[PDB]
């Protein structure tokens, strides 16, 4: 019975071990997607522009 | 004979809309110029690739494009009444 759970418990161990590359690969993509989102806000509005007075 | 068709081809050039004149003020950078139309609004706009170094100027009258508002070619001035003052003798 104790070896039973001993063969059960490494599942979520290894299931969270593959969950390591899960986030790490996901977060770096989204990081590059967030860096791509930095080009977005810097793209807007590009040209042209009009002068205005701050109040 | 064919000079009439030449004037017809000139009408194809007449299809081009006229641009809007403006007075430059100064420049923030090479990519940002401050121009002010005769109507009074000021515009910070980009410029196109066909212009030259003589466009910059210290606040010389220029013409602005109808869309990008970029300067194409600068016209020196225009005056209607001048000719009536030319004829005094």
Curated annotation (Swiss-Prot), chain A:
Family: Belongs to the AAA ATPase family.
UniProt-recorded name of the protein: 26S proteasome regulatory subunit 6B
Compartment(s) where it occurs, according to its Swiss-Prot or TrEMBL record: Cytoplasm; Nucleus
Assembly and oligomerization: Component of the 19S proteasome regulatory particle complex. The 26S proteasome consists of a 20S core particle (CP) and two 19S regulatory subunits (RP). The regulatory particle is made of a lid composed of 9 subunits, a base containing 6 ATPases including PSMC4 and few additional components. Interacts with NR1I3. Interacts with PAAF1. Interacts with TRIM5. Interacts with ZFAND1.
Role: Component of the 26S proteasome, a multiprotein complex involved in the ATP-dependent degradation of ubiquitinated proteins. This complex plays a key role in the maintenance of protein homeostasis by removing misfolded or damaged proteins, which could impair cellular functions, and by removing proteins whose functions are no longer required. Therefore, the proteasome participates in numerous cellular processes, including cell cycle progression, apoptosis, or DNA damage repair.
Organism: Homo sapiens (Human)
Disulfide cysteine pairs (residue numbers): none
Lineage: Eukaryota, Metazoa, Chordata, Craniata, Vertebrata
Domain of life: Eukaryota
UniProtKB/Swiss-Prot annotation, chain B:
Subcellular location: Cytoplasm; Nucleus
Biological process annotations from GO: ERAD pathway; positive regulation of inclusion body assembly; positive regulation of proteasomal protein catabolic process; positive regulation of RNA polymerase II transcription preinitiation complex assembly; proteasome-mediated ubiquitin-dependent protein catabolic process
Keyword field: Acetylation, ATP-binding, Cytoplasm, Nucleotide-binding, Nucleus, Phosphoprotein, Proteasome
Principal location class: cytoplasm
Cellular component, GO annotation: cytosol; cytosolic proteasome complex; extracellular exosome; inclusion body; membrane; nucleoplasm; nucleus; proteasome accessory complex
Kinase recorded as keyword: no
Molecular function GO terms recorded: ATP binding; ATP hydrolysis activity; identical protein binding; proteasome-activating activity; protein-macromolecule adaptor activity
Protein family (similarity comment): Belongs to the AAA ATPase family.
Role noted for this protein: Component of the 26S proteasome, a multiprotein complex involved in the ATP-dependent degradation of ubiquitinated proteins. This complex plays a key role in the maintenance of protein homeostasis by removing misfolded or damaged proteins, which could impair cellular functions, and by removing proteins whose functions are no longer required. Therefore, the proteasome participates in numerous cellular processes, including cell cycle progression, apoptosis, or DNA damage repair.
Name listed for the protein in its UniProt record: 26S proteasome regulatory subunit 10B
UniProt organism field: Homo sapiens
Gene: PSMC6
Residues of the full protein shown: 37 to 125 of 389
């Amino acid at each position: 019975d104790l070896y039973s759970r001993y063969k059960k418990l490494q599942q979520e161990l290894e299931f969270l071990e593959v969950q390591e590359e899960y986030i790490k690969d996901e977060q770096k993509n989204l990081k590059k997607e967030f860096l791509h989102a930095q080009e977005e806000v810097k793209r807007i509005q590009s040209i042209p522009l009009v002068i205005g007075q701050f109040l | 004979t064919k000079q009439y068709e030449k004037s017809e081809n000139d009408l194809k050039a007449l299809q081009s809309v006229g641009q809007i004149v403006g007075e430059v003020l100064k420049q923030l950078t090479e990519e940002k110029f401050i121009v002010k139309a005769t109507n009074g609004p000021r515009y910070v706009v980009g410029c196109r690739r066909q212009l030259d170094k003589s466009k910059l100027k210290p606040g010389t009258r220029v013409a602005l494009d109808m869309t990008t508002l970029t300067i194409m070619r600068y016209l020196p001035r225009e005056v209607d009444p001048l000719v009536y003052n030319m004829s005094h003798e």
